[PDB]
Amino acid sequence: GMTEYKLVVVGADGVGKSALTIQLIQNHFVDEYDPTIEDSYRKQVVIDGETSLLDILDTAGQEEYSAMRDQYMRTGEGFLLVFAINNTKSFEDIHHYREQIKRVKDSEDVPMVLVGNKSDLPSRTVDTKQAQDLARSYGIPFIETSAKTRQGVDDAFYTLVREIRKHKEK
């Protein structure tokens, strides 16, 4: 059969939320995508042999509420917490995103994956160890990606799907 999964991609402006989502749904890198566009995108993939329908909200303008986020923050099953490896402030923001999602969900167990994007760049400011340790403090996976080269993109989304599957078994 199949399973549908509602995913929400969050993180600072410019970390590559749109580039990651577009690499997942269209299999190419789009280097210029309006930073104000917040929308949901549907994509059918196969994960571990099962047909999987992904309904992904690519968030934007997160300093204000939106009706799309009011709907997906409540119904969303899993979240990708994205930072850029060359942006310290985007990594420093991560704990704020997790804390707020936990309050929205009223739960200490919300499926999440930490994503360190832009792994192709030469001037990283966030060491992989700091991100691995932060993910370990939350009990969640950490995946290094590059939306530019497609490195780790399917792994980030599929790992989040695996985290949701485990949560649903409870």
């Binding site: 969050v10 968030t59 997160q62 300093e63 204000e64 509420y65 986020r69 009011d70 923050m73 409540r74 923001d93 704020h96 995103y97 804390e99 707020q100 999602i101 309050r103 929205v104």
Partner: peptide, 14 residues
């Protein structure tokens, strides 16, 4: 600020 959903708000710009 960060306002992902009502009625939460976090000041993350400081």
């Amino acid at each position: 600020f960060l306002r992902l959903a009502r009625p939460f708000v976090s000041f993350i710009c400081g």
